[PDB]
């Protein structure tokens, strides 16, 4: 199947309290595997997946240097952006950076992306052609010109098509036993009477990986039962995910309702009744 | 400036069984800015030494975090999550329901 | 691994 190597960088300025807080995390598919947090005297990039301890000290030293330098660059960018918008020093502001490379089912480079946001809104985008930028306003147009002056699109294209692709291949091989292992959901249905005439049927999906999943309550010919309550897919805390879907049914008709669960770890979709 | 209030889910890692070791989770997601206060409560009292995951965000730039601790569910103990954020006029308390 | 040099804005 398809796979992705993704990083998320966040820098938040702390007025009157020193350098901005900087936190970055790396993901392979739906699995976090590294983290960097500058809230320390000697901040380090550290593993967040057990299979990354196969990486030696040189890897960790290099990633620590890269992340420390990114934080300093982001402190500069926050100051630059504060001047672009003529904003006071008394206000807290946020700069975010996300980038990633995605492989197709053939294992070849399919798409790369890179984007910046300021105070929770799109700021500057590296287009999927990997050769041009798009600015959201006049401030970001100056940032676009800087990127043009430095051939930044060419530099980021090289990272996304070469460095990113190569290391995604390495990570997938080192963590194959978990990254390439589809974990099917464990499913069951719970029943909670609301009154003498109504009841809640809750269809559970527990302990699955990856996070992509579909839950539907079927009521005879209606595949998506009216007023089905879906919760956002949520992490269990152990690397797997959870989700449930609930419906209120007339008491005594629970047998007319069927829950469908579709997940890539299931050879066929599963149906359940209370 | 884009601000988003956090969505809140309080739940256990495994199906709750009284007297059995488990993990109480509080998942805050879809919020901006990243600064947030999350507390886990046992019978209205704050639980000490609660850990949380590394700050990450989604495609729309909104952040998400998982707060978690070890707990022992019982019949009478009342667990809840208390969330405070710049978008909230007052702190929000969401009780733990073992059926949700 | 992550980029060595992050873009300037």
Residue numbers in the entry:
A (entry chain A): 1 to 274
B (entry chain B): 1 to 100
C (entry chain P): 1 to 9
List sentences from the manuscript.
Human leucocyte antigen E (HLA-E) is a non-classical MHC class Ib molecule homologous to H-2 Qa-1 in mice and Mamu-E in rhesus macaques (RM). HLA-E exhibits preferential binding to a highly conserved set of nonameric signal (VL9) peptides derived from the leader sequence of HLA-A, B, C or G molecules. VL9 peptide-bound HLA-E complexes engage the natural killer (NK) cell inhibitory receptor, CD94-NKG2A, thereby protecting healthy cells from NK cell-mediated lysis. Whilst VL9 peptide binding and NK cell regulation are ostensibly its primary function, HLA-E, and its rhesus and murine homologues, can present peptides from microbial and autologous sources to CD8+ T cells.
We then sought to analyse the ability of the B pocket to accommodate a selection of these hydrophobic and polar residues, some of which are present in HLA-E restricted microbial peptides, by crystal structure determination of Mtb44 P2 variant peptide complexes. Similarly, Mtb44*P2-Gln crystallised in P1, however, diffraction data were collected to a higher resolution of 2.1 Å. Electron density was present for both peptides including the substituted P2 side chains. Superposition of Mtb44*P2-Gln and Mtb44*P2-Phe with the original Mtb44 complex structure revealed similarly orientated peptides in the PBG. Perhaps unsurprisingly, considering its depth and hydrophobicity, P2 Leu to Gln or Phe substitutions were tolerated by the B pocket with minimal repositioning of the pocket-forming residues. However, these minor readjustments in peptide positioning due to P2 substitution do not disrupt immune recognition: CD8+ T cells isolated from the spleens of BCG-vaccinated RM mounted responses of similar magnitude when stimulated with Mtb44*P2-Phe, Mtb44*P2-Gln or the index Mtb44 epitope, emphasising the similarity in positioning of solvent exposed side chains and thus their antigenicity in vivo. HLA-E structures crystallised in complex with Mtb44 variants encoding P2-Gln or Phe, or P9-Phe, demonstrated minimal conformational repositioning relative to Mtb44 in the PBG. Notably, Mamu-E restricted Mtb44-specific CD8+ T cell responses in BCG-vaccinated macaques were preserved when the animals were challenged with mutant peptides harbouring Phe or Gln at P2. This supports the possibility of enhancing MHC-epitope complex stability via primary anchor optimisation of certain HLA-E-restricted epitopes in immunogen design without disrupting TCR recognition.
